[PDB]
Amino acid sequence: AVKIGIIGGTGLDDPEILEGRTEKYVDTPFGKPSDALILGKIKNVDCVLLARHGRQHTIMPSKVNYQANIWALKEEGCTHVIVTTACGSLREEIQPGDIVIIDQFIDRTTMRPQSFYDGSHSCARGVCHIPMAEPFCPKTREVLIETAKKLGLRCHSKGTMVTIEGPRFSSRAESFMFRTWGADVINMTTVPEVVLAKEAGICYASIAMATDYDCWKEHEEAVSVDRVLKTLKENANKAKSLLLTTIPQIGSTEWSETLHNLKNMAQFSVLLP
Amino acid sequence: AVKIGIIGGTGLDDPEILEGRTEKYVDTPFGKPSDALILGKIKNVDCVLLARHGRQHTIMPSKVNYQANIWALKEEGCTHVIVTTACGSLREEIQPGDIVIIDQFIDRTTMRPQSFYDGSHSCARGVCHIPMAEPFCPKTREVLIETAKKLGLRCHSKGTMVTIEGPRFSSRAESFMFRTWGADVINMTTVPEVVLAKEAGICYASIAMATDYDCWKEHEEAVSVDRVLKTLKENANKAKSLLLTTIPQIGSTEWSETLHNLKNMAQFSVLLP
Amino acid sequence: AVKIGIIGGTGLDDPEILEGRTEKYVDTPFGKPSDALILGKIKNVDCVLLARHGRQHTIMPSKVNYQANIWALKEEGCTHVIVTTACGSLREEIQPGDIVIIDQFIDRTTMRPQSFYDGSHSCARGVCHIPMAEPFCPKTREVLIETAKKLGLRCHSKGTMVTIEGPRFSSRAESFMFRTWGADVINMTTVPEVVLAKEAGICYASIAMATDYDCWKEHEEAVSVDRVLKTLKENANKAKSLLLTTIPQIGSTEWSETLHNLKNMAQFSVLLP
Numbered sequence: 001a002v003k004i005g006i007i008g009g010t011g012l013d014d015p016e017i018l019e020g021r022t023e024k025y026v027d028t029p030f031g032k033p034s035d036a037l038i039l040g041k042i043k044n045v046d047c048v049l050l051a052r053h054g055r056q057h058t059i060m061p062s063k064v065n066y067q068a069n070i071w072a073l074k075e076e077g078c079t080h081v082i083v084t085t086a087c088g089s090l091r092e093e094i095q096p097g098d099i100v101i102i103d104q105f106i107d108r109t110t111m112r113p114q115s116f117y118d119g120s121h122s123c124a125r126g127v128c129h130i131p132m133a134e135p136f137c138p139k140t141r142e143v144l145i146e147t148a149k150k151l152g153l154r155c156h157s158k159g160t161m162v163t164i165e166g167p168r169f170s171s172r173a174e175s176f177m178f179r180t181w182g183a184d185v186i187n188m189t190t191v192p193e194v195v196l197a198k199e200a201g202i203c204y205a206s207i208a209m210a211t212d213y214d215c216w217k218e219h220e221e222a223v224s225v226d227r228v229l230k231t232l233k234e235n236a237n238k239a240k241s242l243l244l245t246t247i248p249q250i251g252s253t254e255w256s257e258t259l260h261n262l263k264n265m266a267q268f269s270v271l272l273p
Numbered sequence: 274a275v276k277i278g279i280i281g282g283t284g285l286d287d288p289e290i291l292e293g294r295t296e297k298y299v300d301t302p303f304g305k306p307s308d309a310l311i312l313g314k315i316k317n318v319d320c321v322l323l324a325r326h327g328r329q330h331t332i333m334p335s336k337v338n339y340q341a342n343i344w345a346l347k348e349e350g351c352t353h354v355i356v357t358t359a360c361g362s363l364r365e366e367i368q369p370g371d372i373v374i375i376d377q378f379i380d381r382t383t384m385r386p387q388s389f390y391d392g393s394h395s396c397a398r399g400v401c402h403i404p405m406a407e408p409f410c411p412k413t414r415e416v417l418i419e420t421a422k423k424l425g426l427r428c429h430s431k432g433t434m435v436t437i438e439g440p441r442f443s444s445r446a447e448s449f450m451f452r453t454w455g456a457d458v459i460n461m462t463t464v465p466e467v468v469l470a471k472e473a474g475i476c477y478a479s480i481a482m483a484t485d486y487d488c489w490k491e492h493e494e495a496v497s498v499d500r501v502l503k504t505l506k507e508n509a510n511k512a513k514s515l516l517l518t519t520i521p522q523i524g525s526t527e528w529s530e531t532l533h534n535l536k537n538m539a540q541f542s543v544l545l546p
Numbered sequence: 547a548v549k550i551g552i553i554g555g556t557g558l559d560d561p562e563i564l565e566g567r568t569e570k571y572v573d574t575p576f577g578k579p580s581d582a583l584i585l586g587k588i589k590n591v592d593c594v595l596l597a598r599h600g601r602q603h604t605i606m607p608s609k610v611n612y613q614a615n616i617w618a619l620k621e622e623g624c625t626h627v628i629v630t631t632a633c634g635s636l637r638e639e640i641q642p643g644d645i646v647i648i649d650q651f652i653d654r655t656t657m658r659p660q661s662f663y664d665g666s667h668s669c670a671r672g673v674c675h676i677p678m679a680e681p682f683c684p685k686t687r688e689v690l691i692e693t694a695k696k697l698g699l700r701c702h703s704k705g706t707m708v709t710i711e712g713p714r715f716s717s718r719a720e721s722f723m724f725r726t727w728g729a730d731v732i733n734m735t736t737v738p739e740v741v742l743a744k745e746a747g748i749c750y751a752s753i754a755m756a757t758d759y760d761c762w763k764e765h766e767e768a769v770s771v772d773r774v775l776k777t778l779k780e781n782a783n784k785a786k787s788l789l790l791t792t793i794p795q796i797g798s799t800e801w802s803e804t805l806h807n808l809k810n811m812a813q814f815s816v817l818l819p
């Protein structure tokens with residue numbers, strides 16, 4: 001039995017992807033999620049959709065309640081979380097409209113709670129030091145990659161996401177610097193979403209859609225909100241088709257040992273008194 | 274009609290630069306500015322002076338109210354902001370006493386609000402993602418550079434400022450590392466002052482005065498407060514003369530299209546519900 | 547007259563190192579220390595032991611009260627602080643179980659007060675900009691190094707510690723990146739402990755014990771809590787013997803000029819109104 005949480009990003013949070021939709025507002029020990037949970041199905045697979053920024057895109061990336069979002073999806077019974085994120089490209093070969101099935105991150109965030117085990121909640125007791133060597137679910141990523149190929153979509157099979165605090169975009173000196181560090185794409189939302197999913201023992205994967213080349217091409221036009229939203233309007237259908245085609249394959253794969261190993265990794269990461 | 278905000282940094286916030294001075298305490302939706310606004314003139318040009326650290330230098334760089342400072346200058350009608358900042362040199366060729374007309378930054382701050390659009394104020398509604406490819410006003414920088422030359426002052430026509438959280442100085446390992454990232458000078462105040470100015474549609478430029486070589490020369494003597502203040506006492510007159518000579522030239526240049534483009538960039542960076 | 551504060555880290559905070567032990571709970575202007583102070587002696591040398599994480603290891607590295615810990619040790623009369631810390635190795639030659647007498651740090655923390663001079667306490671008035679070129683006491687480090695040699699222990703005579711916010715471990719992209727920056731070992735606790743010790747005019751040194759290779763060897767097994775605690779159980783005796791043998795040598799060295807110079811550096815780092 002699998003149940004797929006879907007966290008929709010900028011321009012990529014369309015509830016019409018699910019059949020048999022029911023709105024459910026929930027609460028958590030960390031406050032309210034970004035919006036109502038949307039319960040529904042893709043073919044025979046139970047899904048839960050959540051708009052990262054609220055359905056009106058009213059919440060700034062620093063202030064998104066990552067804890068409540070992941071807690072809510074876990075509590076509703078999600079075994080997997082697949083998300084979409086709009087991002088800047090830091091590599092010539094990653095063109096606007098390309099999908100990147102990211103496998104690493106570099107944290108540049110500063111103001112964000114990254115753990116459920118913050119001492120303030122009986123629900124999560126102790127100190128948790130979650131391993132981050134392999135932040136994204138390899139098996140889910142493999143299915144996404146194979147499915148993107150079956151769909152004929154321009155897709156990158158790996159990539160390192162640098163997550164900045166925002167809400168400002170990067171300076172050119174920062175953009176250049178992130179490239180030297182080995183970052184391939186840039187956003188404001190992967191961290192700590194990925195970290196909290198791991199603490200929850202959830203199989204997490206991310207569909208990153210490149211929308212611009214940030215500003216590391218001095219000669220070329222720099223990123224702006226209008227440029228990002230334009231690219232997403234033109235390419236959103238690709239992420240939608242990828243999710244729609246991927247999720248039924250996830251539903252027919254065997255997951256008990258993968259989920260058992262995540263559960264164990266999460267459990268043994270906790271130091272108790 | 275131009276009006277020039279001046280934000281004076283460490284050792285470089287002397288109200289006697291303005292003629293016809295009047296003190297004005299103001300409030301903002303983000304709290305009180307660092308000190309009273311000082312209204313005055315340089316030749317025929319209306320100016321507003323503000324001590325970044327208060328006139329007694331009592332406020333630590335992490336706790337400076339960057340939001341209130343920029344909001345106050347905008348509300349008083351400033352079209353431009355030119356600031357002074359004391360900084361460490363990360364490059365042999367940038368000697369103590371040199372001026373650097375910086376054109377880029379790298380953020381190393383952690384605890385600082387960087388946007389007016391924080392959800393908590395009716396004055397600034399929505400989510401703002403300001404572009405930072407070109408953080409400093411090119412036209413103002415050009416006039417500063419040309420004016421420094423006319424004055425015979427040692428001046429660098431570009432430079433990348435790394436802004437650290439402080440209030441501690443950097444370790445030697447950090448100083449070395451910032452050099453590899455492409456930083457040329459180091460301070461505790463450029464970010465988020467520059468970011469907020471951009472959100473306000475203000476033409477912002479910075480006169481950085483090198484006061485020391487930080488600590489990347491192991492063999493040489495490391496930075497300290499006394500070393501910084503000594504260099505500033507010896508060289509403050511240079512920043513004063515540069516401001517006094519620059520501002521009248523700004524006053525006689527045409528600015529409507531430059532200011533229109535900043536206004537547009539700021540306006541279109543805001544996502545509304 | 548010397549008095550040695552000992553801050554015990556993960557797996558390395560055993561009160562049985564001291565003779566003639568007395569528990570003393572104290573308060574400070576920054577709140578309660580992590581646990582009771584343990585007053586005692588090593589040979590004729592007065593010591594004060596403090597468990598960084600509390601004696602039950604219940605406090606996460608982000609939430610440790612570094613200010614109260616250092617203030618408490620200073621107030622009890624400590625001239626020196628020697629600490630233990632568990633860390634990941636970022637260098638092939640630094641093997642699990644090796645000691646590293648670190649001499650530099652790179653800060654990657656985000657949420658942490660790093661100064662006593664935060665404006666909120668009459669006890670520490672003004673703005674303090676402490677120099678960090680030489681964060682660790684050279685004379686104490688020399689004695690630690692010589693003593694490790696006399697004990698036949700695998701020991702590294704220098705090293706750069708990167709301190710991450712945690713409580714998560716690093717991603718592989720982060721681990722790789724820290725190596726390119728020149729970090730040799732990785733933990734969650736050196737900063738701001740070292741910074742506050744310097745502001746207090748205390749001779750501070752750190753015994754870092756490598757417990758794992760973080761995750762920069764993709765082919766090899768990644769760090770986890772169980773792996774860390776296992777290595778510490780096997781090697782804790784080494785840190786204990788090093789402290790026991792080092793402290794009496796510290797007690798018979800002359801320290802007045804070293805301590806005078808730290809006192810002066812701390813005092814002159816403060817800007818008053």
Ligand SMILES: CSC[C@H]1O[C@@H](n2ccc3c(N)ncnc32)[C@H](O)[C@@H]1O
Pocket residue numbers: 010061086087088089164169170186187188189211212213214223224225228229402
């Ligand atoms: C609405 S544009 C900004 C949003 O899109 C993402 N985004 C897109 C491009 C981009 C970039 N070049 N740098 C940082 N974030 C970016 C961020 O995660 C943020 O929530």
Ligand SMILES: CSC[C@H]1O[C@@H](n2ccc3c(N)ncnc32)[C@H](O)[C@@H]1O
Pocket residue numbers: 283334359360361362437442443459460461462484485486487496497498501502675
């Ligand atoms: C009073 S010395 C510290 C002040 O001077 C600036 N400054 C000067 C030199 C320097 C350095 N080497 N590193 C960081 N900040 C520095 C900072 O912005 C801070 O407000």
Ligand SMILES: CSC[C@H]1O[C@@H](n2ccc3c(N)ncnc32)[C@H](O)[C@@H]1O
Pocket residue numbers: 129556607632633634635710715716732733734735757758759760769770771774775
């Ligand atoms: C209980 S394992 C985590 C604790 O050990 C330290 N530690 C050990 C190994 C390690 C690593 N590879 N990265 C970061 N911190 C680490 C940290 O300072 C933290 O308090």
Ligand SMILES: [Cl-]
Pocket residue numbers: 108381654
């Ligand atoms: Cl960083």
